[PDB]
Amino acid sequence: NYTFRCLQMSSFANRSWSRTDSVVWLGDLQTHRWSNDSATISFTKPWSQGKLSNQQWEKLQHMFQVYRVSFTRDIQELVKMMSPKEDYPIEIQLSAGCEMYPGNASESFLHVAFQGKYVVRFWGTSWQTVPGAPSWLDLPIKVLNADQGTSATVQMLLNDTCPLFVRGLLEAGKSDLEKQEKPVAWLSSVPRQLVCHVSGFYPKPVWVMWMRGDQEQQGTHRGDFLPNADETWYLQATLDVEAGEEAGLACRVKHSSLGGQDIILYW
Amino acid sequence: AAVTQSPRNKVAVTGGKVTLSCNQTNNHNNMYWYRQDTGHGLRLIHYSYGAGSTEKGDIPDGYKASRPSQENFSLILELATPSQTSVYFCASGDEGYTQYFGPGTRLLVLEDLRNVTPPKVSLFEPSKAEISHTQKATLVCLATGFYPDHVELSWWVNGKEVHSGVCTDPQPLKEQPALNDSRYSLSSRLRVSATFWQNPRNHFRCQVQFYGLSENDEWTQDRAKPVTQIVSAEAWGRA
Amino acid sequence: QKTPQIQVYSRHPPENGKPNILNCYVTQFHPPHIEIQMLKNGKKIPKVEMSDMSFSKDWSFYILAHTEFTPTETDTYACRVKHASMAEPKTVYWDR
Amino acid sequence: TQVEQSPQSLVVRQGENCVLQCNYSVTPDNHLRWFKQDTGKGLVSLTVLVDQKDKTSNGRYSATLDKDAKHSTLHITATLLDDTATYICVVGDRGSALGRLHFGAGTQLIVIPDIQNPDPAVYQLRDSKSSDKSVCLFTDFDSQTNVSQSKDSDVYITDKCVLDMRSMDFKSNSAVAWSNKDFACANAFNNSIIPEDTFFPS
Ligand SMILES: CCCCCCCCCCCCCCCCCCCCCCCCCCCCC(=O)N[C@@H](/C=C/[C@H]1O[C@H](CO)[C@H](O)[C@H](O)[C@H]1O)[C@H](O)[C@H](O)CCCCCCCCCCCCCC
Ligand SMILES: *[C@@H]1O[C@H](CO)[C@@H](O[C@@H]2O[C@H](CO)[C@@H](O)[C@H](O)[C@H]2NC(C)=O)[C@H](O)[C@H]1NC(C)=O
Ligand SMILES: *[C@@H]1O[C@H](CO)[C@@H](O)[C@H](O)[C@H]1NC(C)=O
Secondary structure, X not given: OOEEEEEEEEEEOOOOOEEEEEEEXXXXXXXXXXXXXXXXXXXXXXXXXXXXXXXXXXXXXXXXXXXXXXXXXXXHHHHHHHOOOOOOOEEEEEEEEEEEOOOOOEEEEEEEEEOOEEEEEEEOOEEEEOOOOOHHHHHHHHHHHHOHHHHHHHHHHHHHHHHHHHHHHHHHOHHHHOOOEOOEEEEEEEOOEEEEEEEEEEOOOOEEEEEEOOEEOOOEEEOOXXXXXXXXXXXXXXXXXXXXXXXXXXXXXXXXXXXOOOEEXXX | OOEEEEOOEEEEEOOOOEEEEEEEOOOOOEEEEEEEOOOOOOEEEEEEOOOOOOEEOOOOOOOEEEOOOOOEOEEEEOOOOHHHOEEEEEEEEOOOOOOEEOXXXXXXXXXXXXXXXXXXXXXXXXXXXXXXXXXXXXXXXXXXXXXXXXXXXXXXXXXXEEOOOEEEOOOOEEOOOOOOOOOEEEEEEEEEEHHHHOOXXXXXXXXXXXXXXXXXXXXXXXXXXXXXXXXXXXXXXXX | OEOOEEEEEEOOOOOOOOOEXXXXXXXXXXXXXXXXXXXEOOEEOOOOEEOOOEEOOOOOEEEEEXXXXXXXXXXXXXXXXXXXXXXXXXXXXXXX | OOEEEEXXXXXXXOOOOEEEEEEEOOOOOOEEEEEEEOOOOOOEEEEEEOOOEEEEEEOOEEEEEEOOOOEEEEEEOXXXXXXXXXXXXXXXXXXXXXXXXXXXXXXXXXXXXXXXOOOOEXXXXXXXXXXXXXXXXXXXXXXXXXXXXXXXXXXEEOOOEEEEEHHHOEEEEEEEEEEOOOOOHHHOOOOOOOOOOOEOOO
């Protein structure tokens, strides 16, 4: 189940200055970058155009190109419409896309965050405020819902254009998505917290456990999944032990890249 | 939806304060001030998103805006200039895209109010030659010696305004074309059937609404004050 | 405002004398305006690569920085981060 | 100026059709509206086009919108004298109150009246309150006849004017001439090229 994300982030410092940058993810892999400086959207994968024709992508890029400008003036006008109830600096994020499921099944989303808090979502045919959101947002919402063009466009994009495009992406990016990368493991200790460093594995699912021969340790504490530059994963596991207990122990790593060939690393 | 403006027509002096008002009982949050000038389209001056709010438009210089309430939105000209001579339009609207426009306000800023003069109106009765020859009677009205050209001529039959069989000069002509401050003249015609003019109970009245000085303008000169007023001439029908 | 978290780690096993890649990964910060320097002995490295900024399902911003480094027993590597949430810049040293 | 109208002005005869152009570069183009503005009066909306390829019709008025070409036309079928007005094109950049409207300068239309049975004549009309002072009315002449302005600065002759006796369906041209300084209706419209069969009474 791959989740497709178009991540927009807009900074409004004062009444005049502002910028908007976008990044696009299919799963844990980046497909597009759209910097504020770049008038056009940039592909970050050879397969980022999915199964779309050149005309189709162009009609779709031009649509977004207009949106970015439209969005910039619109916020500034909504700030004026609200003032003094809202004030600069203003920080707005958008998480929009569609998650894919077996068959031709998918669910689309458009989530808007105001000042680091999730406040607004597009649902069905209209914009609405989420629970917890302030009541003054009802007016901007009403105004956006007045615009029937945007509503029709967003419905098409969320209902049709998102899942159609991602179904095309999965075919074009199979080799990169279904790619397998072997993890590399090394050990260290710190004043002793025994660490099992694991790096360079793809996909993201992994199994790293400390074992005293067969004894799966109850004190194994897995850390956070941290990224690498070459689009692979890094993770570490810290064990809580006393001095002298260094020998006799090992770190075992299970991954799809090895296929039964479990890495076992003795200290 | 209805939007009104007051005044409908205004004559002002350089340096004076002028307030153009706009009333709307549509409960619209948003109200807009524009000006129309020949050669250009309507350009935005100021706009408000509700009571208290005011925002600069495309050409906000020389204008200050005030939104005391949902109902009213005013354009204020602090120190008037001849560059601010224009027809000013007010608009209002809700969250939709439709902007409902008011009737429009003509503003004329003069250097000096000294030359301002109300019109002398004269209604000329139809010719008997016309009545016999055409079976129709043409009344002719005439406003003379007025400055500036900000007048509205209307025809009134029995206390009610008529438009059918009426036409006025599209523009008033100068009496002294050789003069720069020339006073103007305007003519208008009303045509009715001979038998309608022959009716002695039919009251015909040509009316000129003159736009001049306010009840607050200073007047130091000899003759009577040329205030915004109506001047009219009238006649009764005859067989 | 969200206060940033800095985590320094190497791509391959940290071998003294062998060329490698060091990763500085800053997370959990808001607003997104941030200045990040990778240091060698307290000095700013010339060509530090930066990925495009992004955020997670919890709305907090993250950005990965990476440089080529050849570690020795003597050399120190750190990650200096300046952000509006903190009055003073914060530097996190690399540890093997 | 992101909105451009063509022609700048045109002159048609009663009954004929005229097409008015509007080209714009406004981004984005949510909707386009046509306005009719009678000289001195306000802005009467005629129609509003909204689709990528759109067509509407409001009586004798019909308009087309082609957003791909960013171009619009307004056809007027069977022009009446009433249509004499400036016609304004307006493009709005949003489908909500966030939008700003972009106004064209306007196409000017002048419709020449259809005088059915012309009967040119000059009449003398006297003041009701002071029957000494009078005016000379040249009236009931056809469209082809032009009225020359007053050459003598102490004589005043207005431009032609067309009235519509609506309840009778009857139109007539008229022009008024008067002077205070030696002046009569028989010798008033020598300035203009008058028809040979112009009726002079008394
Ligand atoms: C919904 C789309 C993703 C889902 C993804 C599916 C797309 C799949 C294609 C893959 C493409 C890959 C490249 C990715 C590029 C990355 C950049 C995109 C990331 C952001 C997510 C996109 C979601 C926004 C799309 C809305 C675009 C609609 C569009 O252009 N609409 C404009 C309309 C312009 C005008 O002109 C139009 C004609 O063009 C019509 O005539 C309209 O009627 C007219 O108004 C409007 O200005 C519109 O309102 C713009 C504002 C959006 C609301 C969001 C604000 C949230 C509210 C918070 C406010 C809080 C108050 C703070 C004070
Ligand atoms: C896009 O999909 C949504 C559902 O996610 C549709 O919204 C529904 O519309 C129907 C009638 O049109 C309503 O009765 C439902 O209440 C709506 N659903 C929800 C969840 O609100 C929408 O019609 C679709 N739009 C297009 C253009 O296909
Ligand atoms: C972002 O892009 C827009 C359009 O190119 C520009 O007006 C704006 O100044 C840019 N922002 C910054 C911070 O440079």
